[PDB]
Amino acid sequence: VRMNVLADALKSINNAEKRGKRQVLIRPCSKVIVRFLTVMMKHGYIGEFEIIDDHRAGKIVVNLTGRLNKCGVISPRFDVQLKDLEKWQNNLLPSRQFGFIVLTTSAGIMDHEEARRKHTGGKILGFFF
Amino acid sequence: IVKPNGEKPDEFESGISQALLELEMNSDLKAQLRELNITAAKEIEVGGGRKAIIIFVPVPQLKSFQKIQVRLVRELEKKFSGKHVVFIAQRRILPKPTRKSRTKNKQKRPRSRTLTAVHDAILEDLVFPSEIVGKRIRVKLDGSRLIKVHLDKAQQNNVEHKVETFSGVYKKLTGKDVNFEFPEFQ
Amino acid sequence: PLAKDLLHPSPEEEKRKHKKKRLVQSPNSYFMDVKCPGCYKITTVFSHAQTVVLCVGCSTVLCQPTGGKARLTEGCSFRRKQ
Amino acid sequence: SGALDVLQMKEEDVLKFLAAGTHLGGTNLDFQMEQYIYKRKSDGIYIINLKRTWEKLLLAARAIVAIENPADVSVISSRNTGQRAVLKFAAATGATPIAGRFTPGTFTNQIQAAFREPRLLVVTDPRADHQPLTEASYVNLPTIALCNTDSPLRYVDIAIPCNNKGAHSVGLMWWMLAREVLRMRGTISREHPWEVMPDLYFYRDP
Amino acid sequence: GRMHAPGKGLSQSALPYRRSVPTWLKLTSDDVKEQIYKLAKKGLTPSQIGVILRDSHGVAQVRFVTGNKILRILKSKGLAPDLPEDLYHLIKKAVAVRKHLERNRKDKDAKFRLILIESRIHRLARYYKTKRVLPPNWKYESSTASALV
Amino acid sequence: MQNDAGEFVDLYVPRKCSASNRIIGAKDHASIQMNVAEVDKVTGRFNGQFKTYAICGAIRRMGESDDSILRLAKADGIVSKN
RNA sequence: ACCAUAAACGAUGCCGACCGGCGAUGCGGCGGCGUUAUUCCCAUGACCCGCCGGGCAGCUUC
RNA sequence: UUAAAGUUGCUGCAGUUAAAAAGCUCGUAGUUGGAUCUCUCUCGGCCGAAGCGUUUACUUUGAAAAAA
């Protein structure tokens, strides 16, 4: 059955960005997914999206600017201390010049560079570059 | 006619309660109007020049206003100038309980008294004679959202001119950007 | 494909899909308004009705249920509501 | 034809399209060609939208006019029903015709004297001329083609939706493309009808 | 897909978006509740009442008219069954198989279907025992199976 | 691309596909660069300008280069609406 | 009555999402010119043109 | 004995034909599980003492952690 609904959405906009498509429909929406997509959009990787209100759960139609190379989830959400952040971005990120790791911290969902700036650890959701 | 919780009326409330007891004494709606009461009133500025009145009714008396609302809005607009009147229930929003709260939180808050449920029910009754047949939320490139509300086409010419006051009202008492559309078919 | 507006399909295209695969789902049924020819009463009837509906005045059948959609009797004029 | 009153399809062009049968497609429908169909009628034959045949033709004409040396456009038909229209497109335009069998290695084998280096490729049928299509994916060569309803659109870049099975339709499409490329250049004016009758391009078999 | 069957199928209801009652419907909440009350006294299950109210009354959803469910109305009034209607129909099916099976002892493909039915009863009984609908010692047994229906 | 002093330290900046923003590589021999001519809006004759579209080889092997050229030219007003 | 074992073979765990086309077939449902049979008429059956949903398969593809 | 060994694989392997997927279904533990909800009271000097706020996990801090 469908567990880890964010792993569905990140696989859908990975597989559609490879096919050169302009829009993806991901369903069901969630508030974790919307905060993940907002982090990607504010660094230029996706572009605007529209949440479609069914009364059951959402659907999101994401626009795709072809800048995304890879969008991934990390399952399970391991606890990441702030001293452990360098090993995670050594394993996951392709360069020290670009790419992001998305953490859920207690100050919100944010990328790994902002979490250092707020001096916070948390749990890892995924990564994009 | 104006029965607040803090128990002090004001100038618009007096001028609206008088206009409502006028309908209690001349029009044929006395059987409905003698049972009801309002709770607050405001006048906000929309569109740079247009004005709008926000009647506040109690939520147990909400559906009784909605049987007679279309015969109320034009007749109130005749007594005033061109000023679109809007009826909105008076709903509490109990705050989200945290790890640092008070012991007035003894029983769990009902889901109707949440912020999402109140903002999505305020959106239901201010557009009253039409229905909401669909919502889209557009998240723009600066992180800001913009709600699009598709209204019913069967009451299009009734409230087509009101949609620039509706958005200003919902920006006033909620704080959100809303556009109102009319789809050709569902 | 590969540039298809998923937000705004055409209204003859959402009508074609399965009722849960639409952008917002919606049923294929409706409430008809069946008139009995040898009577005056007007009855509300579900279009995909199960067990057979009797007009209580004339005590006659209005629609025998079928697999998909209720089959009316011969001579019952009906209109679809809203 | 960017909503310009100079370039709209006139009455006589529609009459020639209807007389030749360039609106009637085939029986099957490719999923890439679905954008140009009005509807499938009875007797299973798809009708091609002539407003979209006219605008894809006007888009191809701009792609041919945008090449300075006019001999760098090549025009290819490997079946006999379009071999005469290719040879008269190149006499009116100035392109380089290739009729009959396309030699595998014309565009890639640089040792031979058969080696050519065009800048644009116009093709009468993407199914019959499959070999000059695949060789254009080796030498960075854009490709116009006359596509029926069952045509595959791998490596075509401007897909003119006409009928290309009947002998009148092919000749009419090549004639009208020649007239459009000559009208868009400095030569013949858009006022008077063209001197060349469109029956110089038809393939009259024995 | 299905739990005990090896199939998958997309066949279900699909509620509309609009949660309001339609304007043609003239029944209020109280007379609809009166219809539910008079229909529950013929032994009709909650799933059979909503079919009657949909087919011949125009009540598309009782939740949209009354603001409440069918089973909550019959439970607040007191007209509710002792054991729930989807667990009731599973025991009734397990009785009828065991009745047929004691005549026909060679029927292997009712003996196999009995195990699938009876394991679905224990899976459904555990849920109602966690949610405290059944008293937490109620046990389905083959001896006292036939007395419960 | 740029160092901290601001020099451009790169052999060349490669082109990007106008349909799908992919980098057209050095040995991408199926990729296209195509000029579409611009006309004067009262004679319908070739002005001298054009409009350049580049499309990578994977889009052309997909069969999607026809629709991509069409919606790129439709956004520039070269192909009219409908 | 026991025994419970096989090229027990798709030599291929189970559940879930996404990712190309094409024509058939089986079942159910929804529509649609026109043929037949029940003398007409509907209503149905046999065909024909689609659409939807699960199924058994097949062809095809940088 | 460690690296080489991504040939023990958490990072990080494999199971059609190379070693390998249970005859089939049921089913306990285990593992994993769909959306959804935006701080105050008496005293002691406008703040502290008195309560915490459902309870944890998490995260950041502090102090406590022998030397070598």
Residue ranges of domains in chain F = 1-82
Amino acid at D82: G
Q: Is B138 in Cβ contact with A41 (below 8 Å)?
A: no
Instruction: Report which DSSP code applies to B155.
Output: G
Structural element, H or E, at residue E24: none
Is residue E59 within 8 A of residue E65, CB to CB? The reply is yes
Nearest beta carbon to residue B138 from set A34, A37, A50: A50
Partners of residue B184 in chain C, C-beta under 8 Å: 11
Between CA F27 and C1' H11 the distance (Å) reads 36
Structural element, H or E, at residue E139: none
The nearest alpha carbon in chain F to A97 belongs to F1
Query: Would you say the C-beta of B115 is within 7 Å of strand H?
Result: yes
Query: Would you say the C-beta of A123 is within 7 Å of strand H?
Result: yes
Give the chains touching D; criterion: ≥3 Cβ pairs < 8 Å.
F
Between CA A95 and C1' H20 the distance (Å) reads 39
The number of beta carbons lying within 10 Å of the beta carbon of residue C38 is 10
Q: Is B184 in Cβ contact with C24 (below 8 Å)?
A: no
Task: End-to-end CA distance of chain C: give it in Å, rounded.
Answer: 36
Q: Which residues 6+ apart lie within 8 Å of B159 measured at CB?
A: B127, B129, B130, B151, B166
Task: End-to-end CA distance of chain B: give it in Å, rounded.
Answer: 41
Instruction: Report which DSSP code applies to B30.
Output: H
- Is D84 buried (19+), middle (13-18) or exposed (0-12) by CB count in 10 A? buried
Task: End-to-end CA distance of chain F: give it in Å, rounded.
Answer: 42
Nearest beta carbon to residue F79 from set D2, D63, D67: D2
Residue of C22, C62, C24, C30 whose CA lies nearest to C46 = C30
Is residue B18 within 8 A of residue B41, CB to CB? The reply is no
Query: Would you say the C-beta of C68 is within 7 Å of strand G?
Result: yes
Residue of D84, D46, D78, D91 whose CA lies nearest to D181 = D91
Annotated domain spans of chain B: 1-186
Tell me, yes or no, whether chains E and F touch by having 3 or more C-beta pairs under 8 A: no
Annotation-wise, does C55 bind a ligand? yes
A63 DSSP β-pair partners: A23
Q: Is B133 in Cβ contact with E20 (below 8 Å)?
A: no
Query: Would you say the C-beta of A1 is within 7 Å of strand G?
Result: yes
**Hunting for tokens 């036939």 — which residue is that?**
E146
Omega within 30 of 0 (cis) for the link into D198: no
CA distances from D40 to B164, C14, D44, D46, D56 (A): 45, 20, 6, 4, 20
| Strand pairing report for A122-128 and A108-111 | unpaired
Is residue E84 within 8 A of residue E41, CB to CB? The reply is no
Instruction: Say which nucleotide is closest to residue A77, CA to C1' distance.
Output: H58
Annotated domain spans of chain A: 1-68, 69-129
Strand H nucleotides, any atom under 7 Å from protein beta carbons: they are 11-12, 25-28, 32-40, 51-55, 58-61
The nearest alpha carbon in chain A to E17 belongs to A55
Omega within 30 of 0 (cis) for the link into C37: no
Nearest beta carbon to residue C31 from set E10, E12, E58: E58
Distance CA(E114)–CA(E48), nearest Å, equals 26
Cα dihedral E43, E47, E52, E57 sign: positive
Angle at A29 between CA A27 and CA A33, to 5 degrees: 120
Q: Which residues 6+ apart lie within 8 Å of F57 measured at CB?
A: D137, F24, F28, F29, F30, F31
Query: Would you say the C-beta of C11 is within 7 Å of strand G?
Result: no
Query: Would you say the C-beta of A73 is within 7 Å of strand G?
Result: no
- Please report how the helices D50-65 and D11-20 are oriented relative to each other, as an axis angle in degrees rounded to 10: 110
Q: Which residues 6+ apart lie within 8 Å of A104 measured at CB?
A: A32, A77, A122, A123, A124, A125
Partners of residue C6 in chain B, C-beta under 8 Å: none
Number of domains in chain D: 1
Strand G nucleotides, any atom under 7 Å from protein beta carbons: they are 15-23, 28-31, 33, 42-44, 49-55, 62
Q: Is residue D176 part of a domain?
A: yes
Range of the domain at D135: 13-206
Distance CA(F45)–CA(A48), nearest Å, equals 40
Instruction: Report which DSSP code applies to F41.
Output: T
Between CA A120 and C1' H19 the distance (Å) reads 48
Tell me the structure's resolution in angstroms, rounded to a single decimal.
3.0
Residue of C82, E68, C73, E132 whose CA lies nearest to B186 = C82
Is residue E71 within 8 A of residue E128, CB to CB? The reply is no
DSSP string, chain D: --S-TTSS--HHHHHHHHHHTTTB--SS--STTGGGEEEE-GGG-EEE-HHHHHHHHHHHHHHHHT-SSGGGEEEEE-SGGGHHHHHHHHHHS--EEEESPPPTTTTT--SSTT----SEEEES-TTTTHHHHHGGGTTT--EEEEE-TT---TT-SEEEE---SSHHHHHHHHHHHHHHHHHHSSSS-SSSPPSS-TTSS-----
Cα dihedral D82, D83, D88, D93 sign: positive
Instruction: Report which DSSP code applies to C36.
Output: -
Distance CA(B58)–CA(E16), nearest Å, equals 29
| Strand pairing report for C53-55 and D46-48 | unpaired
- Is D53 buried (19+), middle (13-18) or exposed (0-12) by CB count in 10 A? buried
The nearest alpha carbon in chain F to D191 belongs to F43
β strands within chain C, DSSP E? 31-35, 42-46, 53-55, 60-64, 71-72, 78-80
Q: Which residues 6+ apart lie within 8 Å of A52 measured at CB?
A: A29, A58, A59, A60, A61, B136, C7, C23, C24
Residues in chain E whose C lies over 2.5 Å from the next residue's N (breaks after): none
Is residue D175 within 8 A of residue D75, CB to CB? The reply is no
